[PDB]
Amino acid sequence: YEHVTVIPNTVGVPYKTLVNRPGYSPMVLEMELLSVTLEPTLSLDYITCEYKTVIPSPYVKCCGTAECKDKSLPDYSCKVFTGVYPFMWGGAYCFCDTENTQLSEAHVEKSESCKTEFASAYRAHTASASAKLRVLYQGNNVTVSAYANGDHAVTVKDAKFIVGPMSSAWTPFDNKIVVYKGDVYNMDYPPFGAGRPGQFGDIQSRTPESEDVYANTQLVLQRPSAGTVHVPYSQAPSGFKYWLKERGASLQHTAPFGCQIATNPVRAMNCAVGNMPISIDIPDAAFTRVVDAPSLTDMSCEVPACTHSSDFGGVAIIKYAASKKGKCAVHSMTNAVTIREAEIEVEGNSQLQISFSTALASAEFRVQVCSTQVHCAAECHPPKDHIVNYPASHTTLGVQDISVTAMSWVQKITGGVGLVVAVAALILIVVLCVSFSRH
Amino acid sequence: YEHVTVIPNTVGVPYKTLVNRPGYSPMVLEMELLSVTLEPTLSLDYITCEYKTVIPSPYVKCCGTAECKDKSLPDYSCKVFTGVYPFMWGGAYCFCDTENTQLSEAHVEKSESCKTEFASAYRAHTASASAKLRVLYQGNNVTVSAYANGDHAVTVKDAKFIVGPMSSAWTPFDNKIVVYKGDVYNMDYPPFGAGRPGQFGDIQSRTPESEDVYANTQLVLQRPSAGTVHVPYSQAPSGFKYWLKERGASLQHTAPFGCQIATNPVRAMNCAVGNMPISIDIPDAAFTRVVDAPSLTDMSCEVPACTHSSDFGGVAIIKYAASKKGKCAVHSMTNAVTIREAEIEVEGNSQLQISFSTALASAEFRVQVCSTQVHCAAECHPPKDHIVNYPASHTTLGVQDISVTAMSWVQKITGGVGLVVAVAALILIVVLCVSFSRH
Numbered sequence: 001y002e003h004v005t006v007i008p009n010t011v012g013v014p015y016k017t018l019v020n021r022p023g024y025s026p027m028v029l030e031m032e033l034l035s036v037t038l039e040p041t042l043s044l045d046y047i048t049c050e051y052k053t054v055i056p057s058p059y060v061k062c063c064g065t066a067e068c069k070d071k072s073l074p075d076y077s078c079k080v081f082t083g084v085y086p087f088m089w090g091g092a093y094c095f096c097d098t099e100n101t102q103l104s105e106a107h108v109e110k111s112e113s114c115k116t117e118f119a120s121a122y123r124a125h126t127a128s129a130s131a132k133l134r135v136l137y138q139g140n141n142v143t144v145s146a147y148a149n150g151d152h153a154v155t156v157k158d159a160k161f162i163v164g165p166m167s168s169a170w171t172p173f174d175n176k177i178v179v180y181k182g183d184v185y186n187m188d189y190p191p192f193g194a195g196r197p198g199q200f201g202d203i204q205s206r207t208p209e210s211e212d213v214y215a216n217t218q219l220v221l222q223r224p225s226a227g228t229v230h231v232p233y234s235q236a237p238s239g240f241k242y243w244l245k246e247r248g249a250s251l252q253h254t255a256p257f258g259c260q261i262a263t264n265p266v267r268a269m270n271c272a273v274g275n276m277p278i279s280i281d282i283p284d285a286a287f288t289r290v291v292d293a294p295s296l297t298d299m300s301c302e303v304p305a306c307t308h309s310s311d312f313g314g315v316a317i318i319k320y321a322a323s324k325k326g327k328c329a330v331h332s333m334t335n336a337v338t339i340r341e342a343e344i345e346v347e348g349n350s351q352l353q354i355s356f357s358t359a360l361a362s363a364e365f366r367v368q369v370c371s372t373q374v375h376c377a378a379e380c381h382p383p384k385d386h387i388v389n390y391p392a393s394h395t396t397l398g399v400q401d402i403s404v405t406a407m408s409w410v411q412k413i414t415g416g417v418g419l420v421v422a423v424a425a426l427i428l429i430v431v432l433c434v435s436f437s438r439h
Numbered sequence: 440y441e442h443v444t445v446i447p448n449t450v451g452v453p454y455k456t457l458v459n460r461p462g463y464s465p466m467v468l469e470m471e472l473l474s475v476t477l478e479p480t481l482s483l484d485y486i487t488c489e490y491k492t493v494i495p496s497p498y499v500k501c502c503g504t505a506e507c508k509d510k511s512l513p514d515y516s517c518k519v520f521t522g523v524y525p526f527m528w529g530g531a532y533c534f535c536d537t538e539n540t541q542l543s544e545a546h547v548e549k550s551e552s553c554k555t556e557f558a559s560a561y562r563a564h565t566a567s568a569s570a571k572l573r574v575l576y577q578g579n580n581v582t583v584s585a586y587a588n589g590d591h592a593v594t595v596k597d598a599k600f601i602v603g604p605m606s607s608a609w610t611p612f613d614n615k616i617v618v619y620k621g622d623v624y625n626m627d628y629p630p631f632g633a634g635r636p637g638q639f640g641d642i643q644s645r646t647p648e649s650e651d652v653y654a655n656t657q658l659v660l661q662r663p664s665a666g667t668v669h670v671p672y673s674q675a676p677s678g679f680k681y682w683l684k685e686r687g688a689s690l691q692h693t694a695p696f697g698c699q700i701a702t703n704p705v706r707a708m709n710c711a712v713g714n715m716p717i718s719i720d721i722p723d724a725a726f727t728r729v730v731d732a733p734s735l736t737d738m739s740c741e742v743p744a745c746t747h748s749s750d751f752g753g754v755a756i757i758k759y760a761a762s763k764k765g766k767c768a769v770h771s772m773t774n775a776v777t778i779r780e781a782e783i784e785v786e787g788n789s790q791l792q793i794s795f796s797t798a799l800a801s802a803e804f805r806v807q808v809c810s811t812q813v814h815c816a817a818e819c820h821p822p823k824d825h826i827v828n829y830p831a832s833h834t835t836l837g838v839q840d841i842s843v844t845a846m847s848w849v850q851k852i853t854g855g856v857g858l859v860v861a862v863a864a865l866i867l868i869v870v871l872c873v874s875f876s877r878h
């Protein structure tokens with residue numbers, strides 16, 4: 001028997017679905033999402049890391065001008081400085097006083113640190129949804145791990161589960177993301193081969209091991225101080241280091257819908273967005289024939305206490321006369337009231353307790369305790385605690401879910417005004433009918 | 440100088456773009472797409488292959504009944520056949536005649552061939568476009584390899600190229616594809632864990648080396664022939680082998696827009712879809728000053744022959760007076776006519792020869808050479824050949840592109856009728872003005 005139901009994508013909140021298969025005693029399955037993962041498909045664009053500026057020892061010609069040679073190195077710069085008379089610890093380096101010329105050169109290489117310290121620039125396309133579902137089946141807890149794209153069937157205890165597709169394609173990840181050691185950011189990183197100095201992606205490579213490096217640090221060689229050999233330069237500070245200080249909050253801190261973000265692989269977990277359809281194929285052996293089930297008659301529901309405290313604060317006691325010893329599934333007939341127990345045991349003339357959660361001011365609801373139904377009603381009190389550390393187990397209320405006392409007042413007021421109108425309307429109708437009787 | 444142009448997404452067809460930078464001689468860059476690749480990002484769903492049915496030697500018990508326990512193997516089946524009296528070459532196996540029972544069991548597992556012969560069920564999301572472009576930069580042929588997503592700047596001879604994004608997101612691949620070898624199919628393969636017997640996907644695994652195997656072959660054990668030791672069974676033949684015979688045409692042969700399909704990795708190549716924006720950052724060194732360039736005067740154009748073939752039929756002879764020896768760009772001022780040569784050499788008082796193609800019955804166009812325009816005119820003949828094995832070098836014909844003789848006829852006819860109306864209208868206007876001159 002194939003049963004199709006839909007639950008909210010909210011994680012950690014159990015939902016109950018009634019499987020009503022004619023000829024068999026009603027079955028109730030409790031399903032809870034333990035984990036929902038949206039794993040984006042990524043394509044690496046480039047690696048950003050700290051750059052190393054390489055400055056080979058300067059070449060000094062005591063007499064005669066040095067010549068520059070072009071090189072293909074990532075950001076090669078070379079300049080000749082005439083009129084230089086450098087000193088070493090033991091005295092002037094050159095015999096020549098004025099004809100001395102220095103050749104300075106420098107280039108940029110990706111640092112050895114880039115092997116472990118780097119940010120990866122990725123493009124995200126679509127997400128592969130995956131979910132772990134806890135199901136109470138035949139009274140046992142079975143965990144179903146399946147892809148939530150609607151195309152993965154998982155069979156446990158001969159029950160086949162289809163999960164998804166997701167009702168929402170929403171993902172916390174943007175088209176372009178940057179990943180740094182567990183921290184994922186949504187940013188429009190600059191195009192490969194066209195990065196800018198002092199900004200993220202100033203030095204770029206396609207892979208951490210690639211020797212193909214783009215660099216735009218605008219390295220400029222300056223004239224050495226008189227009497228010295230050092231090679232001064234002006235260069236934009238690594239955009240990677242600046243980014244690390246200016247990263248801002250990561251997606252696990254900024255994402256909507258309470259999404260948890262993790263890396264290796266990049267994952268968005270437990271995003272409370274949309275619904276997740278579930279289809280369960282339940283084998284005939286799993287069902288108990290109606291005639292083989294206890295029949296419950298002479299039922300009466302009493303509700304000794306009710307508080308709409310979001311944690312099954314309500315308790316109801318149901319008296320019953322069971323035809324025989326056995327088990328019966330319990331289901332609420334209204335969405336407004338959720339019952340914690342999926343099944344109870346029945347025997348003879350006795351009573352059972354059920355814990356329930358509702359937002360209702362007045363808990364008017366019906367309960368199916370096996371094959372028969374009983375009507376429950378109560379006045380529910382508010383909680384004293386303003387804040388809790390858990391999501392409500394009950395659903396929200398509509399405008400029609402006001403209290404019984406409030407409804408009585410509304411009916412009396414509405415009826416009072418409606419009666420005045422109905423009477424005034426009748427008087428006018430009679431007068432008009434008379435007015436047309438005098439034509 | 441940043442020049443932004445759009446090249447139609449056609450491979451093997453050269454396009455001319457004019458770079459007009461004030462103060463410098465006009466430059467023409469010839470661009471040709473050599474290869475355009477759309478590479479879909481894939482996520483493997485499962486592997487299918489030919490299955491092996493494993494049948495262990497049958498267990499025969501003599502005076503006694505055999506029994507077995509259920510196993511977790513992918514499609515395990517076990518049955519006990521009573522009343523068996525098997526013979527071997529030397530006589531009956533059991534001393535007992537009727538008390539004998541045979542225990543037959545079998546299961547389905549991936550064959551040893553699945554490591555080599557298999558089909559991969561992939562999910563295709565979006566494609567990363569890339570292209571190889573030929574550019575006639577500075578009179579030389581420069582090959583640019585770049586991603587075509589608006590990213591990946593490529594610098595060649597100090598000229599920086601940005602390619603894309605593509606004007607069309609269209610791809611030949613559906614969201615579900617199946618890859619066998621060099622063939623890719625747009626197949627809506629069945630959900631994992633829920634394949635059907637005798638059909639593709641009857642046996643499934645997540646990876647070629649995975650021990651996680653789903654199988655649905657309807658393997659049913661049959662009673663053995665009397666006196667014979669064997670385990671007969673009814674099983675649906677491999678759906679993989681059936682699929683191989685029923686594969687049909689692959690996307691390589693069925694895809695629209697002339698798309699070429701290849702695998703390892705999966706690629707769609709040279710699809711004639713939409714267009715591809717190109718932005719070129721051209722260094723000032725690449726431009727020649729107007730004063731340094733040759734200046735042409737006293738230009739005239741004649742066309743010894745013209746045929747409006749898809750090839751470069753039609754030759755224009757242009758006479759010129761050049762102030763200096765040198766070279767300059769040649770550009771057509773009309774889209775209707777394309778000139779094969781991008782640049783020519785000019786000297787003194789001489790003539791230049793260029794080839795062009797057009798769909799025009801009457802070729803009327805202006806040619807800009809060294810910033811001087813000359814007007815050409817010709818009567819073009821139709822081609823004798825009906826079909827060629829190459830795409831037209833010229834653009835399409837507009838509704839306004841009518842021959843000069845035909846245009847003359849239209850003007851004479853339209854003018855003649857318009858004149859009759861204008862005269863008739865004048866007569867009526869005069870009569871009405873007279874009518875209103877009464878009283």
Ligand SMILES: *[C@@H]1O[C@H](CO[C@@H]2O[C@@H](C)[C@@H](O)[C@@H](O)[C@@H]2O)[C@@H](O[C@@H]2O[C@H](CO)[C@@H](O[C@@H]3O[C@H](CO)[C@@H](O)[C@H](O)[C@@H]3O)[C@H](O)[C@H]2NC(C)=O)[C@H](O)[C@H]1NC(C)=O
Binds near residue numbers: 014136139140
């Ligand atoms: C099926 O599982 C549910 C939920 O239990 C959770 O999921 C399971 C698969 C396991 O991973 C559990 O470790 C995990 O908690 C079971 O219901 C839960 O039972 C536990 C006791 O085992 C309850 O803990 C206590 O409950 C009392 C109630 O008065 C509290 O006072 C205690 O402070 C403490 O919380 C837990 O609350 C309860 N959860 C719910 C929603 O009812 C369920 O019993 C199990 N069924 C079977 C047959 O295993």
Ligand SMILES: *[C@@H]1O[C@H](CO[C@@H]2O[C@@H](C)[C@@H](O)[C@@H](O)[C@@H]2O)[C@@H](O[C@@H]2O[C@H](CO)[C@@H](O[C@@H]3O[C@H](CO)[C@@H](O)[C@H](O)[C@@H]3O)[C@H](O)[C@H]2NC(C)=O)[C@H](O)[C@H]1NC(C)=O
Binds near residue numbers: 453573578579580
């Ligand atoms: C720049 O490149 C173009 C195009 O050439 C193509 O791309 C190059 C990068 C190379 O890969 C070439 O192998 C490739 O074809 C050159 O124009 C082409 O020149 C060739 C001759 O070298 C022409 O082939 C001839 O065409 C005539 C036509 O009548 C035939 O009779 C000959 O037998 C022969 O096939 C080719 O047609 C022509 N292509 C076009 C569109 O005109 C170009 O010369 C080159 N320039 C430089 C400086 O290298």
